[PDB]
Write a protein that holds these residues in place. Structure first.
Motif, short mmCIF file in Angstrom:
data_model
loop_
_atom_site.label_atom_id
_atom_site.label_comp_id
_atom_site.label_asym_id
_atom_site.label_seq_id
_atom_site.Cartn_x
_atom_site.Cartn_y
_atom_site.Cartn_z
N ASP A 112 -113.26 30.81 5.34
CA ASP A 112 -113.82 32.03 4.79
C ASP A 112 -113.01 32.62 3.64
O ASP A 112 -111.90 32.17 3.34
CB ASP A 112 -113.95 33.06 5.93
CG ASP A 112 -114.99 34.14 5.65
OD1 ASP A 112 -115.77 34.00 4.67
OD2 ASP A 112 -115.00 35.14 6.39
N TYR A 121 -109.41 31.08 9.04
CA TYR A 121 -109.19 32.21 9.95
C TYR A 121 -109.32 31.74 11.39
O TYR A 121 -110.36 31.23 11.80
CB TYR A 121 -110.18 33.38 9.70
CG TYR A 121 -109.55 34.72 10.06
CD1 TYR A 121 -108.98 35.52 9.08
CD2 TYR A 121 -109.45 35.14 11.39
CE1 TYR A 121 -108.35 36.71 9.40
CE2 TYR A 121 -108.84 36.34 11.71
CZ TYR A 121 -108.28 37.13 10.71
OH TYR A 121 -107.66 38.33 11.01
N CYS A 122 -108.24 31.89 12.13
CA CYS A 122 -108.23 31.60 13.55
C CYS A 122 -108.68 32.86 14.30
O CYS A 122 -107.91 33.82 14.36
CB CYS A 122 -106.83 31.15 13.99
SG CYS A 122 -106.73 30.57 15.71
N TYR A 123 -109.91 32.86 14.81
CA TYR A 123 -110.45 33.99 15.58
C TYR A 123 -109.92 34.03 17.02
O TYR A 123 -109.78 35.10 17.60
CB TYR A 123 -111.98 33.93 15.61
CG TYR A 123 -112.65 34.51 14.38
CD1 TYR A 123 -113.28 35.75 14.42
CD2 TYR A 123 -112.63 33.83 13.16
CE1 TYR A 123 -113.89 36.30 13.29
CE2 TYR A 123 -113.25 34.36 12.02
CZ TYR A 123 -113.87 35.60 12.10
OH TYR A 123 -114.47 36.12 10.98
N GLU A 124 -109.69 32.86 17.61
CA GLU A 124 -109.33 32.75 19.03
C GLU A 124 -108.50 31.49 19.23
O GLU A 124 -108.79 30.45 18.61
CB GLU A 124 -110.56 32.65 19.95
CG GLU A 124 -111.60 33.75 19.81
CD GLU A 124 -111.13 35.06 20.39
OE1 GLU A 124 -111.78 36.10 20.10
OE2 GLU A 124 -110.10 35.06 21.12
N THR A 159 -105.30 37.48 13.91
CA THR A 159 -104.95 38.81 14.36
C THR A 159 -104.33 38.69 15.74
O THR A 159 -104.87 37.96 16.61
CB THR A 159 -106.18 39.76 14.44
OG1 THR A 159 -106.84 39.84 13.16
CG2 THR A 159 -105.75 41.18 14.93
N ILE A 190 -101.69 41.30 11.45
CA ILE A 190 -102.28 40.14 10.86
C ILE A 190 -101.16 39.17 10.60
O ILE A 190 -100.17 39.54 9.96
CB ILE A 190 -102.99 40.49 9.54
CG1 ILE A 190 -103.91 41.71 9.68
CG2 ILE A 190 -103.79 39.30 9.05
CD1 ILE A 190 -105.08 41.47 10.58
N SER B 1 -106.61 37.06 18.32
CA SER B 1 -107.96 37.34 18.85
C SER B 1 -108.73 38.33 17.98
O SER B 1 -108.24 39.42 17.68
CB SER B 1 -107.89 37.87 20.28
OG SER B 1 -109.10 37.59 20.97
N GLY B 2 -109.94 37.94 17.59
CA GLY B 2 -110.76 38.74 16.70
C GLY B 2 -110.23 38.71 15.28
O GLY B 2 -109.36 37.88 14.94
N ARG B 3 -110.76 39.61 14.44
CA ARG B 3 -110.34 39.72 13.04
C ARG B 3 -110.23 41.21 12.70
O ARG B 3 -111.25 41.86 12.45
CB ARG B 3 -111.32 38.98 12.06
CG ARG B 3 -111.12 39.45 10.57
CD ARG B 3 -111.19 38.44 9.37
NE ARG B 3 -112.33 37.53 9.34
CZ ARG B 3 -112.76 36.91 8.24
NH1 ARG B 3 -112.19 37.10 7.06
NH2 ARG B 3 -113.80 36.08 8.32
N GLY B 4 -109.01 41.74 12.70
CA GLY B 4 -108.77 43.12 12.32
C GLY B 4 -108.72 43.28 10.81
O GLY B 4 -108.73 42.28 10.08
N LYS B 5 -108.68 44.52 10.32
CA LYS B 5 -108.62 44.75 8.91
C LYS B 5 -107.17 44.75 8.50
O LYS B 5 -106.37 45.41 9.14
CB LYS B 5 -109.28 46.06 8.54
#
Ligand SMILES: CC(C)(COP(=O)(O)OP(=O)(O)OC[C@H]1O[C@@H](n2cnc3c(N)ncnc32)[C@H](O)[C@@H]1OP(=O)(O)O)[C@@H](O)C(=O)NCCC(=O)NCCS
Ligand code: NA
Lengths: 197, 5
Positions: A112, A121-124, A159, A190, B1-5
């Motif tokens: 992305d 981007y590693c979401y999980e 995150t 982040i 976990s997830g995507r913060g700003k």
């Protein structure tokens, strides 16, 4: 590099990565993890390519592991919204199978644009208790890192909760992720690890 | 976990 051309390449590289048939195909030797009493096969699929039961398993594992930490954060836990995220068409999955029947670990990642950059981007990244502290997580994130190098992403980002102390140490110390410039430094940070080109 | 700003 001219701006419009720079913006074009960014989009081109992210789109090319998302058109890949199997991103793990570039180094299939990483489709096996056999170390520390663990013996696992690893596959890389768009979420569209997973059985509904597997998706449920991933959502369930994530909720079981992360719900309290989500409630302790500004986000709170939102079931439907976490389901949406993990079932977005743009979602990629790395999944570890103990047998051809049992999933024991996964990563949700995407290719992305983030803060103007092409990123992985590693979401999980989520493991069953029983396969933890055996190098599988580190193995999974290296796979993400190799894919980012191969697809020309600038970094792997993620995150992490400040109150997920163990995961923070995993990424920050063991995997040597940095605090990303886009980090609020909030109950989260982040993290990123740059590619080397 | 997830995507913060
Ligand atoms: C966090 C997680 C992904 C790490 O994967 P893992 O396979 O268990 O960790 P690894 O075996 O690859 O660990 C590599 C090194 O990172 C460090 N590390 C890993 N997990 C740690 C933890 N919970 N606490 C402190 N250090 C940790 C250790 O230094 C470890 O080396 P060691 O076992 O020789 O001491 C995994 O344990 C997990 O699924 N936890 C539950 C879900 C979660 O919190 N995910 C957070 C992603 S945002
Ligand atoms: Na995670």
């Amino acid at each position: 590099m001219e701006e419009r051309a720079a913006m074009d390449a960014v989009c081109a590289k992210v789109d090319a990565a998302n058109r890949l048939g199997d991103p793990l195909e570039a180094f299939p030797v990483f489709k096996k993890y056999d170390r520390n009493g663990l013996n696992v096969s690893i596959e890389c699929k768009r979420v569209s390519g997973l059985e509904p039961a597997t998706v449920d398993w991933a959502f369930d594992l994530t909720k079981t592991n992360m719900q309290t930490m989500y409630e302790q954060s500004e986000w709170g836990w939102k079931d439907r919204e976490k389901r949406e995220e993990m079932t977005d068409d743009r979602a990629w999955y790395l999944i570890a199978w103990e047998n051809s029947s049992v999933p024991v670990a996964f990563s949700h990642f995407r290719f992305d644009v983030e803060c103007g950059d092409e990123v992985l981007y590693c979401y999980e990244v989520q493991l069953e208790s029983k396969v933890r502290r055996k190098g599988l997580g580190k193995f999974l994130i290296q796979i993400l890192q190799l894919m980012a190098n191969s697809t020309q992403m600038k970094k792997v980002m993620l995150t992490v909760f400040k109150h997920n102390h163990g995961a923070y140490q995993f990424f920050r110390e063991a995997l040597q992720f940095e605090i990303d410039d886009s980090s609020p430094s909030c109950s989260y940070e982040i993290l990123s690890r740059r590619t080397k080109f | 976990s997830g995507r913060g700003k």
